[PDB]
Amino acid sequence: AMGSMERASLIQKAKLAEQAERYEDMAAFMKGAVEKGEELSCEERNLLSVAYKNVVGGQRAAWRVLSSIEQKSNEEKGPEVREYREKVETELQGVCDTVLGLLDSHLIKEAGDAESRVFYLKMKGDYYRYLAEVATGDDKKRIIDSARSAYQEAMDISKKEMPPTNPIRLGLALNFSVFHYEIANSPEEAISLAKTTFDEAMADLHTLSEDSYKDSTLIMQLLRDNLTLWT
Amino acid sequence: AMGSMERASLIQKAKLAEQAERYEDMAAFMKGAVEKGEELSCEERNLLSVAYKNVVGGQRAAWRVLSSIEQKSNEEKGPEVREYREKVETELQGVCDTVLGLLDSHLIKEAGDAESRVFYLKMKGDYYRYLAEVATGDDKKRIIDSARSAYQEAMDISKKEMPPTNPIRLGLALNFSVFHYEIANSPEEAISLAKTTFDEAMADLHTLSEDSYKDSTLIMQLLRDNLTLWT
Numbered sequence A, B: 001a002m003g004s005m006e007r008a009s010l011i012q013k014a015k016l017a018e019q020a021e022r023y024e025d026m027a028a029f030m031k032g033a034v035e036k037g038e039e040l041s042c043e044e045r046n047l048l049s050v051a052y053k054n055v056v057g058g059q060r061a062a063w064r065v066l067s068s069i070e071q072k073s074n075e076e077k078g079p080e081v082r083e084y085r086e087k088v089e090t091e092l093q094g095v096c097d098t099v100l101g102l103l104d105s106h107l108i109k110e111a112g113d114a115e116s117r118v119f120y121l122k123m124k125g126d127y128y129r130y131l132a133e134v135a136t137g138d139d140k141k142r143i144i145d146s147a148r149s150a151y152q153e154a155m156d157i158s159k160k161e162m163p164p165t166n167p168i169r170l171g172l173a174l175n176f177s178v179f180h181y182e183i184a185n186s187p188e189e190a191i192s193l194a195k196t197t198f199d200e201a202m203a204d205l206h207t208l209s210e211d212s213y214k215d216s217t218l219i220m221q222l223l224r225d226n227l228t229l230w231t
């Protein structure tokens, strides 16, 4: 539906939608911009990420509420709780599949710089992770391994190509630690990764401007917040 | 799309959607329930109202953000702000027209008890009021008069048939005062209505149980909050 709108108009409208807190519209505008086929700038990658993280965040919150009610039900109240949890689940899967589709066609393959490639691979890890949260069985196993593989490729590039305080490197490590703790049943791997990431960023802070220091220390606090939750 | 689902399943899912904060789904489930053609109970009227008030509330908040940006623009940045404000405006009008359609087909005509009839006429006033907020010109005049007429019929019934502390009577008076202040350019009528409503409810509080007292005084505080904003 966005095929007739200029790329620059799609970007401008995504920024308007963000101001209006209209995140579904924001995601649709950014999907349209990606589908123009040009690479995204740093600012545009961030719009894409913010839009979808807010859309999927709404669905994840709802899915948790409904899953909890369903689990409690398990007086008979009929199929309705399961049906509606499934509806929300299907819509959530559809959003994840859309994002993964954009990454595969063709954002990741054209991303040559470390900052873009790590950003997109982290996104690939995150959206497979959201799929894993609602998956069951071995179906679940291949999804978990897809998330793992994407995060691992991102980490390998980030460690070779970015400083330990780079915010995208920090955010990737934070989310991969969350993957280990919440999805992969590997709380020790989670704690080790978050601690090493934190310590290596601390040792690099002296190299940063006031503004970069603020950006890095904000994400380090998130790693610290998790380490406090986990230990 | 809800034609194949049982009425009771639609109601149950509306309550689930409210818990999950999925207000668009909640409105769709309640629209489906109304379209079954049976009258709504007090609890079901309240679900219908909560659902649509949240949906339209999101649109009104967005429309205000975009209208403000548009008015500021009036460097040339092209048609995009106007286009996107119009998109949001159209969707908002569509929601209002949907609610008004449900009231006209056939909720109001089958509502014989005071509590149902006043509730639906208040809703008719509110949704024409939301249409008036985005309307221009004389188009605007007939919309304002539709809101007025609906509120006036509701007030006439409420004054004849309900005690001055009845929460629906109180809410109707609050919203009609807001209509006078914000839409009809009649701040004196707004202040007079809110003050008389407040004073007449205060004099009736002695007749109420602890629980009814809590329900009434909560809405009286809203009338007081507006009177403080307006004087």
Ligand SMILES: O=C(COc1ccccc1P(=O)(O)O)Nc1cccc(Cl)c1
Residues within 6 Å of the ligand: A056, A057, A058, A060, A061, A062, A064, A126, A174, A175, A178
């Ligand atoms: O509360 C959280 C915290 O999740 C994180 C914490 C640190 C890094 C990354 C995440 P996330 O990508 O799972 O959102 N996420 C969340 C976000 C939106 C909806 C719901 Cl239900 C949960």
Ligand SMILES: O=C(COc1ccccc1P(=O)(O)O)Nc1cccc(Cl)c1
Residues within 6 Å of the ligand: B056, B057, B058, B060, B061, B062, B064, B126, B174, B175, B178
């Ligand atoms: O802030 C308000 C206050 O409006 C009222 C105050 C007292 C009674 C009735 C109303 P409302 O029916 O205009 O929401 N409403 C509002 C509700 C949702 C979105 C936006 Cl932008 C505004």
Ligand SMILES: [Cl-]
Residues within 6 Å of the ligand: A083, A084, A087, B013
């Ligand atoms: Cl459903």
Ligand SMILES: [Cl-]
Residues within 6 Å of the ligand: A109, A110, A111, A112
């Ligand atoms: Cl490449």
Ligand SMILES: [Cl-]
Residues within 6 Å of the ligand: A013, B083, B084, B087
């Ligand atoms: Cl638009």
Ligand SMILES: [Cl-]
Residues within 6 Å of the ligand: B109, B110, B111, B112
């Ligand atoms: Cl009747």
Ligand SMILES: [Mg+2]
Residues within 6 Å of the ligand: A006, A007
């Ligand atoms: Mg072009």
Ligand SMILES: [Mg+2]
Residues within 6 Å of the ligand: A077, A078, A079, A080, B009, B012
């Ligand atoms: Mg049932």
Ligand SMILES: [Mg+2]
Residues within 6 Å of the ligand: A086, A089, A090
């Ligand atoms: Mg399923």
Ligand SMILES: [Mg+2]
Residues within 6 Å of the ligand: A039, A110, A111, A112, A113
């Ligand atoms: Mg390239």
Ligand SMILES: [Mg+2]
Residues within 6 Å of the ligand: A114, A161, A162, A163
């Ligand atoms: Mg480098």
Ligand SMILES: [Mg+2]
Residues within 6 Å of the ligand: B006, B007
């Ligand atoms: Mg039936």
Ligand SMILES: [Mg+2]
Residues within 6 Å of the ligand: A009, A012, B077, B078, B079, B080
């Ligand atoms: Mg422009």
Ligand SMILES: [Mg+2]
Residues within 6 Å of the ligand: B086, B089, B090
């Ligand atoms: Mg218009």
Ligand SMILES: [Mg+2]
Residues within 6 Å of the ligand: B039, B110, B111, B112, B113
């Ligand atoms: Mg009747």
Ligand SMILES: [Mg+2]
Residues within 6 Å of the ligand: B114, B161, B162, B163
């Ligand atoms: Mg009576």
